[PDB]
Amino acid sequence: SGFRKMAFPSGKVEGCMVQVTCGTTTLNGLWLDDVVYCPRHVICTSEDMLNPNYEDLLIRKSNHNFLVQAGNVQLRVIGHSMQNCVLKLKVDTANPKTPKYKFVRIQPGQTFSVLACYNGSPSGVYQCAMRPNFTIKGSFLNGSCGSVGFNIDYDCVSFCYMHHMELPTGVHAGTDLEGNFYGPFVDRQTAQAAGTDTTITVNVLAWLYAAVINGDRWFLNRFTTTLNDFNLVAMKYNYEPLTQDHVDILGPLSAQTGIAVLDMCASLKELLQNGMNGRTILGSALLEDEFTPFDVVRQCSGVTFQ
Amino acid sequence: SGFRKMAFPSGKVEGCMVQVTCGTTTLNGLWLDDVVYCPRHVICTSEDMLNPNYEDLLIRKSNHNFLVQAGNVQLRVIGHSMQNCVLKLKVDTANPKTPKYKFVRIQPGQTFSVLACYNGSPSGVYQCAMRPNFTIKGSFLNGSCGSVGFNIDYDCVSFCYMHHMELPTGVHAGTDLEGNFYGPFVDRQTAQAAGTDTTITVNVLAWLYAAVINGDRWFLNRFTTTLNDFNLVAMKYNYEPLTQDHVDILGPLSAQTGIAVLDMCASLKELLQNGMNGRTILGSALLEDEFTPFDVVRQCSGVTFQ
Numbered sequence: 025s026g027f028r029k030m031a032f033p034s035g036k037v038e039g040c041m042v043q044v045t046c047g048t049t050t051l052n053g054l055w056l057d058d059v060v061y062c063p064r065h066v067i068c069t070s071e072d073m074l075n076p077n078y079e080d081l082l083i084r085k086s087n088h089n090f091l092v093q094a095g096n097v098q099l100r101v102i103g104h105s106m107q108n109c110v111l112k113l114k115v116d117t118a119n120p121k122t123p124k125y126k127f128v129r130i131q132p133g134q135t136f137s138v139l140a141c142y143n144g145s146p147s148g149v150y151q152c153a154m155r156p157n158f159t160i161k162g163s164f165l166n167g168s169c170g171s172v173g174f175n176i177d178y179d180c181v182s183f184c185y186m187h188h189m190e191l192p193t194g195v196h197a198g199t200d201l202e203g204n205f206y207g208p209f210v211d212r213q214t215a216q217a218a219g220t221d222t223t224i225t226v227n228v229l230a231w232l233y234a235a236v237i238n239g240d241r242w243f244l245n246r247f248t249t250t251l252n253d254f255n256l257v258a259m260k261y262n263y264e265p266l267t268q269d270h271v272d273i274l275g276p277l278s279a280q281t282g283i284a285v286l287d288m289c290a291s292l293k294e295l296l297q298n299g300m301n302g303r304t305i306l307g308s309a310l311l312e313d314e315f316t317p318f319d320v321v322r323q324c325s326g327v328t329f330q
Numbered sequence: 331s332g333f334r335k336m337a338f339p340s341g342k343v344e345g346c347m348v349q350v351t352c353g354t355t356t357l358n359g360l361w362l363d364d365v366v367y368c369p370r371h372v373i374c375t376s377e378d379m380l381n382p383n384y385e386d387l388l389i390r391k392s393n394h395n396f397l398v399q400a401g402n403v404q405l406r407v408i409g410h411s412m413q414n415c416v417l418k419l420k421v422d423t424a425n426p427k428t429p430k431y432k433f434v435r436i437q438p439g440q441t442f443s444v445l446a447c448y449n450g451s452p453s454g455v456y457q458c459a460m461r462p463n464f465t466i467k468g469s470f471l472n473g474s475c476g477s478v479g480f481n482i483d484y485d486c487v488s489f490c491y492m493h494h495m496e497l498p499t500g501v502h503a504g505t506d507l508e509g510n511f512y513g514p515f516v517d518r519q520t521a522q523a524a525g526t527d528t529t530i531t532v533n534v535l536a537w538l539y540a541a542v543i544n545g546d547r548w549f550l551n552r553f554t555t556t557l558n559d560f561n562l563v564a565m566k567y568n569y570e571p572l573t574q575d576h577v578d579i580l581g582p583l584s585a586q587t588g589i590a591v592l593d594m595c596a597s598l599k600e601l602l603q604n605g606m607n608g609r610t611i612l613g614s615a616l617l618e619d620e621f622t623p624f625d626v627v628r629q630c631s632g633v634t635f636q
């Protein structure tokens with residue numbers, strides 16, 4: 025029993041992190057096969073970030089201007105290209121620890137593990153979710169750029185995030201591994217505002233099912249509700265509207281606990297209106313939305329990986 | 331910026347997990363050099379656990395009764411011994427991925443990362459703390475026994491915990507790598523009660539310093555207090571008493587934020603008496619005590635490992 029905010033094992037990702045240095049800027053890179061991926065603002069200076077012309081800046085750089093370093097192994101750049109907001113540095117040596125990887129662009133509400141790195145060296149791992157406003161509430165310092173987010177499907181590593189910048193508000197924004205930003209953000213030092221951050225309702229419901237599995241059942245009430253009447257209350261408290269696809273995903277959790285999804289929605293509706301009365305659920309005084317229904321099933325069944 | 335419950339990278343530990351099977355019982359083992367460590371109750375059946383005589387049970391076992399499996403590599407046991415509550419299965423092949431390791435027995439209040447495993451395969455990683463009652467609030471299912479807890483000091487892995495059993499109350503108990511249980515627990519299926527679980531005060535203070543670093547300063551008040559008057563209030567709410575050694579550890583955090591330790595204690599005293607007024611600190615509606623002062627300095631400075 026028990027429930028923890030659990031991250032994936034980072035072993036297969038640690039062997040892919042390298043140190044990228046262009047001039048004076050140094051950040052992290054992802055070494056897969058004979059290609060190194062890194063944020064393109066590594067070619068910028070402290071003064072270029074206010075309004076960078078990346079095309080003009082990249083012209084003044086050649087293959088010998090970039091220095092990729094894998095611990096103590098010195099790599100050599102053969103070709104360089106700019107795919108959207110990431111650089112593709114083609115090197116001579118293929119990474120012998122390249123796992124079965126895959127590039128994926130996740131949707132808001134999904135979760136992934138972040139391997140925070142500095143100077144190409146792993147520092148820590150934590151789990152987080154893509155907020156509805158396409159930001160993440162992570163833990164990043166200067167030099168952590170190039171750190172990647174990922175999921176693991178048995179023997180396959182699914183890279184889905186690369187850290188690019190910290191907003192003036194304290195939240196974090198990045199791209200997929202093809203260089204496309206999550207959200208309307210651009211990689212320049214300017215005031216950029218994120219949208220309203222709402223609560224992932226389908227995740228909260230999965231979290232309540234995990235609570236029933238682990239013994240916390242005080243929030244189970246006598247009432248039921250309709251899908252429209254729940255969304256009417258949910259939108260008042262800035263919650264994502266629940267769809268029929270969300271009910272289908274929660275099917276297995278409903279069958280294991282014997283509690284209908286609409287009955288669980290009625291319990292959540294009463295919690296949103298009356299609060300938590302100073303009590304806790306799974307050791308938390310707030311409603312958590314960083315657990316997808318698949319995360320709950322995975323932790324409550326013991327799913328392993330390669 | 332940002333603050334997350336961060337675990338250590340698990341790469342160096344993943345390569346040491348093996349599957350141990352004695353008869354019908356199968357759990358996880360730790361393969362370091364040519365020795366495999368695992369809980370000794372792997373030699374028991376479902377009926378032996380009520381009152382096992384491990385010495386008599388181990389006599390009826392030989393070296394060919396244990397089956398250690400490292401993924402797809404079949405190992406062979408040459409000698410077996412029982413050190414307290416763990417088995418030392420001496421094998422023929424030395425683990426080629428054995429890192430610079432070290433066995434340590436942590437004190438209550440310290441934190442470590444847990445690599446939850448099933449059938450010798452890693453499942454997930456999370457950070458937790460040794461409670462004052464020598465239990466941990468983890469996430470373990472059946473078959474997770476043998477999973478280890480660890481810290482990383484640059485290039486050295488410090489193993490400090492091996493999971494042995496789940497109490498009827500839902501909390502978890504285990505041993506160090508020498509087989510000595512943390513707490514007064516014994517490895518048999520009987521009603522065992524843990525002591526009163528108190529709050530690690532020195533950890534809460536370090537967490538409040540992390541909050542000031544990240545912008546949350548609403549809890550900073552006008553008052554100060556004495557070390558005796560704070561402990562008088564702390565013991566009322568089941569908090570660990572603060573010592574002078576705790577003040578010395580919080581020294582660097584005091585110098586970085588410019589806030590005296592006793593001034594931070596006065597803010598905590600008012601929070602314990604008046605509550606949090608429905609507000610949050612670092613996104614939490616409760617006081618967290620699973621961050622040591624070293625954890626805060628590590629995450630707020632960017633400490634990397636090998």
Ligand SMILES: *CC(=O)N1CCN(Cc2cccc(Cl)c2)[C@H](CC(C)C)C1
Pocket residue numbers: 049051065069070073164165166167168169170187188189190210211212213214
């Ligand atoms: C992630 C990381 O290492 N950094 C975040 C900011 N980087 C520069 C920057 C500033 C403003 C906007 C953008 Cl898109 C990027 C920093 C890299 C070096 C120190 C210039 C650090």
Ligand SMILES: *CC(=O)N1CCN(Cc2cccc(Cl)c2)[C@H](CC(C)C)C1
Pocket residue numbers: 355357371375376379470471472473474475476493494495496516517518519520
């Ligand atoms: C950790 C783990 O795999 N298990 C916890 C309980 N194990 C048996 C048990 C029961 C009661 C007391 C003690 Cl010390 C140990 C289980 C191992 C097999 C299934 C017997 C599972």
